[PDB]
PDB file of C-alpha atoms in Angstrom:
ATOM      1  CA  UNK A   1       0.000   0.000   0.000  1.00  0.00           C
ATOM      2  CA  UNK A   2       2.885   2.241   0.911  1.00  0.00           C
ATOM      3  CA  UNK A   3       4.194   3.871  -2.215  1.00  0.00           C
ATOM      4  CA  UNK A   4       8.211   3.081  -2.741  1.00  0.00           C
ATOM      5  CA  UNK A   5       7.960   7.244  -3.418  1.00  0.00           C
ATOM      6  CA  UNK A   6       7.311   7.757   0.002  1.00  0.00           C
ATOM      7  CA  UNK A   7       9.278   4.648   1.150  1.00  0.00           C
ATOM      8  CA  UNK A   8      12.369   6.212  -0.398  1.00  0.00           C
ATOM      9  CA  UNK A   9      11.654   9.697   0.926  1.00  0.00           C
ATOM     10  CA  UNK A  10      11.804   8.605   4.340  1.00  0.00           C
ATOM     11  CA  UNK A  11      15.447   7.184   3.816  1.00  0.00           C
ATOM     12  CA  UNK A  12      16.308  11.035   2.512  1.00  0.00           C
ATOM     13  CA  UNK A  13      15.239  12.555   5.110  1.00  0.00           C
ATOM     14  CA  UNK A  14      17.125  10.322   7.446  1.00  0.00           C
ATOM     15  CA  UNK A  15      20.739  10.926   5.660  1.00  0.00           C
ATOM     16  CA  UNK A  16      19.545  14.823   5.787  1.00  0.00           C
ATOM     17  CA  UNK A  17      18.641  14.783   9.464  1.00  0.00           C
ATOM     18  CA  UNK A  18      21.923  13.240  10.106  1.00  0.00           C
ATOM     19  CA  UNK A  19      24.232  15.347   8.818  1.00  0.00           C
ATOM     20  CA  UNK A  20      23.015  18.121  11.602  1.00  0.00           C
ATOM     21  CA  UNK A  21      22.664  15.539  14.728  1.00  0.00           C
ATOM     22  CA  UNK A  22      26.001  13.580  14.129  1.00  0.00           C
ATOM     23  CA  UNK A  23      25.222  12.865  17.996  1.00  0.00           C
ATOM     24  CA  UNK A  24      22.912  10.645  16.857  1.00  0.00           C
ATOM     25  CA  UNK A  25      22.327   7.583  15.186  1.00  0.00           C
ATOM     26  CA  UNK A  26      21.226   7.221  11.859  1.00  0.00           C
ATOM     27  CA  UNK A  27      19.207   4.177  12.122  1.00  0.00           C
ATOM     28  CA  UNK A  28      17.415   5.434  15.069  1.00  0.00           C
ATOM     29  CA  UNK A  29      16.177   8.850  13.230  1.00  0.00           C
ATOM     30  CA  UNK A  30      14.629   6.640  10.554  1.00  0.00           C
ATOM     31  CA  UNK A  31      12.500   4.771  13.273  1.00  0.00           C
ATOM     32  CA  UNK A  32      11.787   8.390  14.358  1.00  0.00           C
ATOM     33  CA  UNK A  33      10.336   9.209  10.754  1.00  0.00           C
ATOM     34  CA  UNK A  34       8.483   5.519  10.344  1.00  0.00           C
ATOM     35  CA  UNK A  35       4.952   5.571  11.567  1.00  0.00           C
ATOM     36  CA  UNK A  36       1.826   3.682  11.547  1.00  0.00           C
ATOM     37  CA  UNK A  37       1.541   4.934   7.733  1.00  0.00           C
ATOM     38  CA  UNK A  38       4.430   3.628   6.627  1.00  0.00           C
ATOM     39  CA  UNK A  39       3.285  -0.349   5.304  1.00  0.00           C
ATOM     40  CA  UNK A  40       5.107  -2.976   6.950  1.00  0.00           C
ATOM     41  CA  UNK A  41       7.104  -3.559   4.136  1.00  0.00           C
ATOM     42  CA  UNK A  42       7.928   0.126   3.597  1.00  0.00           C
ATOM     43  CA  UNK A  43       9.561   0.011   7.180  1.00  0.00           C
ATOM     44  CA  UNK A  44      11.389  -2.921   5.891  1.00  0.00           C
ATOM     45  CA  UNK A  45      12.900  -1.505   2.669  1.00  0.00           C
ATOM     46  CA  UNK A  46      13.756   1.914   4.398  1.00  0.00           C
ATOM     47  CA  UNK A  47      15.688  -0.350   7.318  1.00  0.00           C
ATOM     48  CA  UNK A  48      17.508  -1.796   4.279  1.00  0.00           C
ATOM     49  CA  UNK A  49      18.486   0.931   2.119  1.00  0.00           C
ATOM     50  CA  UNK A  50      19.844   2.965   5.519  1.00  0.00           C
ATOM     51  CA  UNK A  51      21.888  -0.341   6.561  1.00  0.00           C
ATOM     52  CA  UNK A  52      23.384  -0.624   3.377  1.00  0.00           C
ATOM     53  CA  UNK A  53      24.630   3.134   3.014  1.00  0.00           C
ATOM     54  CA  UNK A  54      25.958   3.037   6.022  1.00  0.00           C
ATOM     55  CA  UNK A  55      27.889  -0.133   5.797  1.00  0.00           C
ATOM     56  CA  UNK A  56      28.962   0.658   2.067  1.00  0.00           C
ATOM     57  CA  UNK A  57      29.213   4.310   2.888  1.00  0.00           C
ATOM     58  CA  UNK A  58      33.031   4.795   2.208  1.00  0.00           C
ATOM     59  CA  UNK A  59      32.621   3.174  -0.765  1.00  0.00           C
ATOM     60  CA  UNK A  60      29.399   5.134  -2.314  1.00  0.00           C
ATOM     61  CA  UNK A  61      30.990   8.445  -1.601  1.00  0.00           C
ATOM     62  CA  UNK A  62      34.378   7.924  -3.414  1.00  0.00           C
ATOM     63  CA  UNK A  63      32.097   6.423  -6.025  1.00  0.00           C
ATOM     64  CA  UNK A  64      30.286   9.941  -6.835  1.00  0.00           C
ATOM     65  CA  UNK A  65      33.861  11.654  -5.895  1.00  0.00           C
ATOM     66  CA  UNK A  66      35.257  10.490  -9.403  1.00  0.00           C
ATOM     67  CA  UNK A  67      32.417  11.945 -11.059  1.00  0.00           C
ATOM     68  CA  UNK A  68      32.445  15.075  -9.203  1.00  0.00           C
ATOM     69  CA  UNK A  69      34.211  18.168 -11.593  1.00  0.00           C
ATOM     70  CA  UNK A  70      32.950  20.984  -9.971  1.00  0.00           C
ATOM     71  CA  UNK A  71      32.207  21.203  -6.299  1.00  0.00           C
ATOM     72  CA  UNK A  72      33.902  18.335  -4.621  1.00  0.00           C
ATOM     73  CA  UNK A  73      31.712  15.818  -2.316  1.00  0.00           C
ATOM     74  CA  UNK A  74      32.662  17.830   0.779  1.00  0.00           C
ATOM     75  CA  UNK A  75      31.315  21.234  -0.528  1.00  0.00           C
ATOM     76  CA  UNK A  76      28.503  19.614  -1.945  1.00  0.00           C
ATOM     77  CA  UNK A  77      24.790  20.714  -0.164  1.00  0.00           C
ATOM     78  CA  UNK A  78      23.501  18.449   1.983  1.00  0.00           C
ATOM     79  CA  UNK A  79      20.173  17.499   0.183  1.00  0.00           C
ATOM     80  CA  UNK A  80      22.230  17.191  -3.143  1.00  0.00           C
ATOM     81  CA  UNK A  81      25.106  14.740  -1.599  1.00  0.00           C
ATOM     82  CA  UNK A  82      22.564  12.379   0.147  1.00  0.00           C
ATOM     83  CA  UNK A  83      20.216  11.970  -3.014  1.00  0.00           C
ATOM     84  CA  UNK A  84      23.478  11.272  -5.014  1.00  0.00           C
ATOM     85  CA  UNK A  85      24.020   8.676  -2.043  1.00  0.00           C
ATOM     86  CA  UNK A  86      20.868   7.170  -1.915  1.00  0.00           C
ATOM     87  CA  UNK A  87      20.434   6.980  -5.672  1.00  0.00           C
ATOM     88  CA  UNK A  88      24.003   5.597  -6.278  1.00  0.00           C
ATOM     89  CA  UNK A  89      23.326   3.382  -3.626  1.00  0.00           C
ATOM     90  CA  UNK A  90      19.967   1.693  -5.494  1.00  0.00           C
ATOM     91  CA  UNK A  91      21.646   1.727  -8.664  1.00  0.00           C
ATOM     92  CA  UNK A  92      24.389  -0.670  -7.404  1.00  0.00           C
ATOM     93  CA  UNK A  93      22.249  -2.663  -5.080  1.00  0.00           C
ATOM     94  CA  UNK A  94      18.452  -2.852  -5.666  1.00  0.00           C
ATOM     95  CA  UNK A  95      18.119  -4.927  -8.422  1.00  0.00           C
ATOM     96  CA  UNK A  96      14.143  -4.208  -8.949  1.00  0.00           C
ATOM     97  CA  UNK A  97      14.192  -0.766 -10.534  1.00  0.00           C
ATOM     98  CA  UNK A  98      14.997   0.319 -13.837  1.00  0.00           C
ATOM     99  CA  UNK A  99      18.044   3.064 -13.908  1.00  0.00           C
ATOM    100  CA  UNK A 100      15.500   5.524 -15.174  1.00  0.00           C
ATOM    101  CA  UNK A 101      13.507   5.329 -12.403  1.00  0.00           C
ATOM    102  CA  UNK A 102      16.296   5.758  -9.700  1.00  0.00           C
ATOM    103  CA  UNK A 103      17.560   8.897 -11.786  1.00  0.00           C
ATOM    104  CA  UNK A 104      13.925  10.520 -12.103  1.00  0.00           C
ATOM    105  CA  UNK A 105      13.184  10.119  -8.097  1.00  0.00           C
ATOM    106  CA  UNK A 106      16.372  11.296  -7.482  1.00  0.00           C
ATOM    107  CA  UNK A 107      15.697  14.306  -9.436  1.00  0.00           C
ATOM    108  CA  UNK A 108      12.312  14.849  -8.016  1.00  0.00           C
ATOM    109  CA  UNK A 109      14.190  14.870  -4.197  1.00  0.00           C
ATOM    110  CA  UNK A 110      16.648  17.130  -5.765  1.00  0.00           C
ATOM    111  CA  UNK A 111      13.998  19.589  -7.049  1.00  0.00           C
ATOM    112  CA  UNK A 112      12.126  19.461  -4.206  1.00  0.00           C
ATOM    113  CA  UNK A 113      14.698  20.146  -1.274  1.00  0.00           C
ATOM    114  CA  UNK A 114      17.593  21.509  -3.288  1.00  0.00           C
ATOM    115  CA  UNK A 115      18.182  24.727  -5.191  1.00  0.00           C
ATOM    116  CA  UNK A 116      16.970  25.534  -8.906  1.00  0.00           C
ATOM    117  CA  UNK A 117      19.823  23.846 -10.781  1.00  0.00           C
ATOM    118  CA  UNK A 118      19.932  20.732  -8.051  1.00  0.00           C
ATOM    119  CA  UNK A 119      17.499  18.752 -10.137  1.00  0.00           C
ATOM    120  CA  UNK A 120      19.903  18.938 -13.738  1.00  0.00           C
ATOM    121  CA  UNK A 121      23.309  18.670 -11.563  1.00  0.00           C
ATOM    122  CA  UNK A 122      21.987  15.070 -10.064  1.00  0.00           C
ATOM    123  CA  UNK A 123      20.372  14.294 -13.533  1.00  0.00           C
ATOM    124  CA  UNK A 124      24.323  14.625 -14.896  1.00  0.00           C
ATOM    125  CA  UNK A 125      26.300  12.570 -12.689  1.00  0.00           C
ATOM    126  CA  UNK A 126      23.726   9.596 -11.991  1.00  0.00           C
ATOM    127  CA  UNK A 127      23.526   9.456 -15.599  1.00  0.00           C
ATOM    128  CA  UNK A 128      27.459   8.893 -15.908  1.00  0.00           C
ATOM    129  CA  UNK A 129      27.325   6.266 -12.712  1.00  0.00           C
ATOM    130  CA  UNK A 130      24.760   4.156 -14.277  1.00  0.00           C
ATOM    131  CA  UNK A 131      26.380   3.838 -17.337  1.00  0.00           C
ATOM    132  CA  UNK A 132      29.479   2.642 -15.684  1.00  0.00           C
ATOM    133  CA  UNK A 133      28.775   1.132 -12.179  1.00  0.00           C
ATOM    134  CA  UNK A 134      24.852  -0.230 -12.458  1.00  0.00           C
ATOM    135  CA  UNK A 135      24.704  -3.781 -12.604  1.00  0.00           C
ATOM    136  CA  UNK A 136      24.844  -5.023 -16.521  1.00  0.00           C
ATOM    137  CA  UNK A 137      21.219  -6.927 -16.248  1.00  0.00           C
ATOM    138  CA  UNK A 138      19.708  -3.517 -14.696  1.00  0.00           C
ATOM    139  CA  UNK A 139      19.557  -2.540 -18.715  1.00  0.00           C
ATOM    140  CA  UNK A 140      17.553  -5.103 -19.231  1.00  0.00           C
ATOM    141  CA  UNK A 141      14.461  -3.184 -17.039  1.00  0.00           C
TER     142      UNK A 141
END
């Protein structure tokens, strides 16, 4: 019942809550933004896309550094770092979703958190990751 859209935004907003309570952990705040609307499932996919950032974290983040050519990751906003890190993240590792659809929800995030230009600066360098780091079979979808 609980649309992956909304599943998905939940996992945003925990990576952008975190970044301003570092005191904190990041697994907690998304029980903090689950509630009784959230599907059972829904719960269950947002528990699994925050444990695997955080476990492949290191590795996500030098991913999207290589792509980087203007800002570096560091200097990047916060909203526009985490949807590259959530995104880059279901490229690589849920094998359900067409690359087209990660890249279009990513934009919408963008757009709707970010500045003006967020949504075409994500657009760009997801583009370039899929091509070279989405599992082969994912152009199948």
């Amino acid at each position: 019942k609980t649309p992956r859209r909304r599943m998905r935004l939940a996992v945003f907003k925990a990576l952008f809550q975190h970044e301003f309570r570092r005191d904190e952990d990041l697994e907690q705040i998304l029980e903090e933004i689950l509630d009784e609307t959230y599907d059972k499932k829904a719960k269950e996919d947002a528990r699994r896309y925050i444990r695997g950032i955080k476990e492949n974290l290191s590795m996500i983040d030098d991913l999207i550094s290589r792509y980087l050519e203007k800002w570096s990751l560091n200097r990047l906003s916060v909203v526009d770092r985490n949807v590259l890190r959530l995104a880059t993240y279901e490229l690589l590792f849920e094998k359900d979703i067409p690359i087209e659809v990660t890249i279009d929800e990513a934009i919408e995030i963008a757009k709707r958190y970010g500045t003006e230009n967020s949504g075409k600066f994500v657009n760009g360098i997801l583009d370039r990751i899929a091509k070279e780091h989405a599992p082969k079979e994912k152009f199948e979808l």
